[PDB]
Amino acid sequence: EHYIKHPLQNRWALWFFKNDKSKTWQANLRLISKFDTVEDFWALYNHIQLSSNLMPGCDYSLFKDGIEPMWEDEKNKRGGRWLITLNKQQRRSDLDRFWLETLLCLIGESFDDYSDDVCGAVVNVRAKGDKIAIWTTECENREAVTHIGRVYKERLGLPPKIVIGYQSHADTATTKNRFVV
């Protein structure tokens, strides 16, 4: 307790995507590193660029170790994501705030029993408008998905006026909302 690091429920892996049109989507997706304590998380977060500062076309992904941040993964292919669409004014006011809140929801296991349904989260930095999402394992788990959505929206501080949607990765890889909150 005087000397022991604070362990997390899960080990997490941070990934970085930079578009290179000469490579497959997968090959542009690279591991930064992994951590399984609070201290190790802050050691990583504190040395890397804020999302608002990345080049357009870059992503961060934070996924539970053993889950690859792509829809092909066993634990992603039946799932989907809660999506936050930002405009260009929100890159300034909201992007980095929202992303850090998202990471804290993951590492802290903020969704009670349904934190097990969380796979990971991704921030897309794009000229057109940034996106943040939380991916869950099974689009058919209505209680899990719906509980995660509610608590996420609460944690982000989004007003009742703003409505966010959840889309199955099947639909996206083929977009309609299975749920909104």
Binding site: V38, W42, E101, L104, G108, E109, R155
Partner: peptide, 14 residues
């Protein structure tokens, strides 16, 4: 099951 408050996690950042 290991859960952490936002407040605790923020306190650790430095």
């Amino acid at each position: 099951r290991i859960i952490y408050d936002r407040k605790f996690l923020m306190e650790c950042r430095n």
